Amino acid sequence: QKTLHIYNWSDYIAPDTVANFEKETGIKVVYDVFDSNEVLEGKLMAGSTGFDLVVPSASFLERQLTAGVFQPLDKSKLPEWKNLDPELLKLVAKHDPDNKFAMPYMWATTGIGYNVDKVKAVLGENAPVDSWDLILKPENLEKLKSCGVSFLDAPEEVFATVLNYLGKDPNSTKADDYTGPATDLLLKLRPNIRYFHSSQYINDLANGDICVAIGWAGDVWQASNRAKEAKNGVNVSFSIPKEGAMAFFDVFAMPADAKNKDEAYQFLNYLLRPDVVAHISDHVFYANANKAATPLVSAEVRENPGIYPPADVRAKLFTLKVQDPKIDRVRTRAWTKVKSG
């Protein structure tokens, strides 16, 4: 029997996607999840992952390509490749030249999830929910400490966001930008942050246990929808702040030592069907990269400007660049100071 090992982000697939693929193809799927680019990259660099498909962010895949940990996708086994948005392909091609290694899957932004009522109770009806001031200004965060604050456990994203907020290059190659103002601000914020974590904030926003989080858009929209279906009265929203925000593109890639490559190609082409991936978007509240699928996704997802943002909001989004070894070391050490204490 055929078996296929997949390592994807958590909360990133419809409930029935895998079961439908199994019953159509007869392949048994082993499906596991992660919430951290650093965890996946560490697996890729330490040895065999034991997976046939993994899903890094494109900015991390750029770094991973030069280690040789992926093999190029045979485009002749991906006929539905045509369905992909060419403009998104061109953006991902900045990380994966000529799109040789990566199939764009979902994309979104790193912004602010928050409890509408709690934030307005603490900072007033005019709470600056359209601005990184909400969480990155120490006076505001000290007051939101009362109802719970979480940051992503995602150092490249947090530092780029802080740097942009401070008016620096989000991808500054100036070491002092990291050790000076970025670390200073983050250390001022630190005593107000309940935890650093990239998946617990979903149920904690849904449950009312935290009131504001740095989070990924569709994760926050999932939390909003979980509160709605529980009818617990918790109102969660998501903000792409006025100063801009990081955009990311999560992409399927094939490890160089993948065991069941024919089956992996069958799954990638399954995900390229417009009806298959639109249905995923319906359940996970993320924009997919499939331009033929967009009319098939539900109106409540397609028309949400925090999921499919319009041109003027997209014009304010930035993306990660790969840093040299000095900056990587400086950023990692500063993250360590921030996250342990």
Q: How far is the CB of 225 from Cl ion (least distance, A)?
A: 20
250 annotated as a binding-site residue: yes
Q: Which residues pair with 65 in a beta bridge?
A: none
- SS3 for 222-283 is HHHHHHHHHCCCCCEEEECCCCCEEEEEEEEECECCCCCHHHHHHHHHHHCCHHHHHHHHHH
- In the complex with Cl ion, the residue whose CB is nearer, 79 or 124, is 124
- In the complex with Cl ion, the residue whose CB is nearer, 141 or 258, is 141
Residue nearest to Cl ion (CB): 124
Q: How far is the CB of 235 from Cl ion (least distance, A)?
A: 17
Q: Which residues pair with 8 in a beta bridge?
A: 33
- In the complex with Cl ion, the residue whose CB is nearer, 98 or 125, is 125
10 annotated as a binding-site residue: yes
How many CB atoms are located within 10 Å of the residue 90 CB? Answer: 10
209 annotated as a binding-site residue: no
- In the complex with Cl ion, the residue whose CB is nearer, 202 or 297, is 202
Cα–Cα distance for residue pair 36/51, rounded to 1 Å:
16
Cα–Cα distance for residue pair 20/119, rounded to 1 Å:
41
Q: How far is the CB of 34 from Cl ion (least distance, A)?
A: 6
Establish how many alpha carbons lie within 13 A of residue 316's alpha carbon, considering only the half-sphere containing its beta carbon: 17
Q: How far is the CB of 95 from Cl ion (least distance, A)?
A: 24
Scored b (16 or more CB within 10 A) or e, 198-209 reads bbbbbebbbebb
Q: How far is the CB of 119 from Cl ion (least distance, A)?
A: 12
Name the residues that contact Cl ion, by CB under 5 A: 35, 124-125, 194
- In the complex with Cl ion, the residue whose CB is nearer, 125 or 229, is 125
Which residues carry a binding-site annotation for putrescine? 10, 219, 250
Residues belonging to the binding site are 10, 219, 250
